[PDB]
Amino acid sequence: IAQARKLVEQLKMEANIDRIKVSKAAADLMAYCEAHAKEDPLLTPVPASENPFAEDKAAVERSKMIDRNLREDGEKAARTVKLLLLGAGESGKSTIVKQIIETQFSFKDLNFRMFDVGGQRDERRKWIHCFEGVTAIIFCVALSDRMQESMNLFKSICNNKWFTDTSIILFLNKKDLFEEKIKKSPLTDYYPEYAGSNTYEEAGNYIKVQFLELNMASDVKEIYSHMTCATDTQNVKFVFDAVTDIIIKENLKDCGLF
Amino acid sequence: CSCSSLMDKECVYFCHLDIIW
Amino acid sequence: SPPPCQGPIEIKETFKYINTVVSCLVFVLGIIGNSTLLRIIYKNKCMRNGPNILIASLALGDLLHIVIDIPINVYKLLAEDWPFGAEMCKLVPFIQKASVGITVLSLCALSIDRYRAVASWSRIKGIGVPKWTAVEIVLIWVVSVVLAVPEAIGFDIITMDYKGSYLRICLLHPVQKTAFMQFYKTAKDWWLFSFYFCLPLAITAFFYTLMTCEMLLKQRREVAKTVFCLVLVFALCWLPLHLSRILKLTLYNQNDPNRCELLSFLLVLDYIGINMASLNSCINPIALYLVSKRFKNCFKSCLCC
Amino acid sequence: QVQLQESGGGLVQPGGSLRLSCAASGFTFSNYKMNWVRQAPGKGLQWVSDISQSGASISYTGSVKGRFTISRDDAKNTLYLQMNSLKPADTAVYYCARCPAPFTRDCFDVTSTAYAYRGQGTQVTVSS
Amino acid sequence: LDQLRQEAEQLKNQIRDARKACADATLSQITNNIDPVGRIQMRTRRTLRGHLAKIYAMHWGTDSRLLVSASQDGKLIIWDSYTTNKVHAIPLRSSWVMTCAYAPSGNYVACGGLDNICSIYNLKTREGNVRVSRELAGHTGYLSCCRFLDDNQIVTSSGDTTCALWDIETGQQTTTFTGHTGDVMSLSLAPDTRLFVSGACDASAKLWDVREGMCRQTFTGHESDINAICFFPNGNAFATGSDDATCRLFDLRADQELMTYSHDNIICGITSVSFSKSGRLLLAGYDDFNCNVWDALKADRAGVLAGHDNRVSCLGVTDDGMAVATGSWDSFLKIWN
Structure with a gap:
């Protein structure tokens, strides 16, 4: 009743417009760009004399020192293990990051730089390309039973080029809460009954296979799988195992021994 | 390709027909 | 002079037909296989990391060996003469000993990275072209050309008559002048088999022995076979040639009247070696097509069109 | 104003057949990958069909395999999806989502809320 | 309400009819007689290196001498194009940056990104000293473009479909522009700095007026997301440069698209657009690491600027127009002539 009632008012504001039509506007563009053609360096070559192509020599020294710290600043970033976790927003992000809002973590001589983006809008097609080159994504879809929107994101990243090589x-997440929820209500109420069973081992597989359905499961980008709980102690250990495996794989690929 | 000495005619001829190594 | 022989030394014209064809194939199949490996590296910036610089060294040192082995050894198999002049008699045999130096050193430098990568994973992912490799290579090429210095000095052409036929042979004169080189003549056939064959198989088999132990998820198993074969196809392609020279030094005896037959046999085995040995330098780029998807995708864009 | 208008949605008894179309306009419906996203009750926007630009690369969700088919027709300038032996759980509002990037298989934010390239949809229904 | 939707459709239909009657002779017909520009050739002079990551933006200065770069490196190098000297190199709290601006007076720069802040820095305010001055928060959704219209005012596009205007001194937002449905992607201030245009991901640019904060006109002729728009010199037009692989030159006073710059071989999208001093030449970057110059009046190519191996993510012409600069994802910034 009031979602576009403002737009219809706007369109009327665009209607009562005094419009000079193309058979004076082309001349308007034509008149400006022909009278200003004499001053355009690109349209007409500017005379060779005007074309150029104490403190400065000191400035040459500033540039070197400035260019020095860039190499040192890049040293940390060179050894940094970049990561991101999508999790479709609401998920067990607090527990995992506890063990743009960029946290940090270092272990066994490495510098993890976990990146969480839950504060953005759902449409991420104009900024997700900034994460090309991240070592690997970390999906942490919690089985709190958004489940659906998480799957759709899996479809997009698993079928895009920027993430073709990022594992x-x-x-x-939340295995205890998931089991408590499903001990009474089965999964088949909202999903097809292909599960045919109500447990915690098959369900974890049944949720997994849906993700396996949409992927290429290539010998390179094989997914990693270890269900995690907020009362567990092996979540970060499995993250470390996967990340070190991915680093070894990147090294071997670089050596050509892959 | 070499052997005792060029006193031996046959051995030198072998170097004639042998790879350059 | 020693006693005469019961028969002449000759190489069957039938064998000439067989070998000259194999030399032609490996000559082409190596130039394309190793020049197309250079084209791949030199065109993609992202492929220029630490270990990939060495592959350019192994490949670069493998075009030289192919080029300086087939045309001058095939020509011998057919022409049986040395009209190249006195200078090149000290040049061609010098280059091939250098080129073989890079190939085995690069296969050793490459071998350490395949261990550094798996064991020292944290630190290896550092600079794109670490200064260490830039100075590791310089020694490898400079050391190789240094170690082949003796051949240029020692080799010299002579004048001789045989069965009424006048001949000239490029060779290492048995009457070497100085003590250092005099020991060289009686040790070359053991030096080559030691520094250039036994040592790289000692090194490359070593780090690759520690890499697989460190590496060991069924994919990583096939990574070993990429190495279990590469070292294996190094001994199967190089054992003959050294075996040919070792047998000459050992089983030859100028005092045996039945000797000239053995000389004929070595010529066949010696000439096969220049092909099998040249195959190894010609085989590494192939091994990158069957494992490296990044290279294979580059090969497909380079050889299939 | 790129517009994609759908038609064919209606009631059908379980196990039957149904085909619905998408007469697009405003753009060149020959170089854009396109989808069929449904919005069932109790759920958000889901992804079903993945007709690529060529017309040979088509993908489906596990809930939809061996039953749905998708097709394109440049001459008629329309998209086509068909449901055979559909179960009662196919009671959504099927939309006709074009992907934002022509000449590529990057279909990234087609199911997002407030997306700009899916028509109003047809209220497909299944009775009992 | 049903009538409101039908009313919207009816008034949209009548608006086009008002536009349809206005178009009597397309732009190409009258400008057929004028001699085309001819293939121009501008070859690089300066490849300004120093960034360790793909650079996402840049901007010139009214002096036409000092540049700015912004990249995922996390740095904001300010160059001296004449000598390629790194005059400044600023770090910032959040590495990710998608835009950068250079105040027309030259005493300030602003640089936002995927943090929802356009943080300003006092560039050459104190000798050998530059620090974060202001942080303009409260702007939901990532930030995609900032521009200075005066020492104390900034217009910023956003990921949340808004183009709020700010007061740097008080750090409080004064007037917010709304109406886009897809996130906004670019700005371009008019020379008179009372109007500005904002292309977004709804395939529709809109003309805003700074003073009274209303949408004067809405333009739509595209088929995909609009990426980067420039505003015609004289002040009565602007090119669009969308992911549609084409540039369209719209014109105010007519509410219609004058021409379309597209060629069947160009298959990728567009990520940058700019004009020349006189506006005759249109320069647009593409995803195929290739910027090619366009004849704004003839819609024919007039050269390429192939000097990068990765996407040309930015480009701009100097205020005097004596030079052009393009940045790209290859991490090198190039200055043409």
């Missing part, structure tokens, strides 16, 4: 890790 993907998949985590099933």
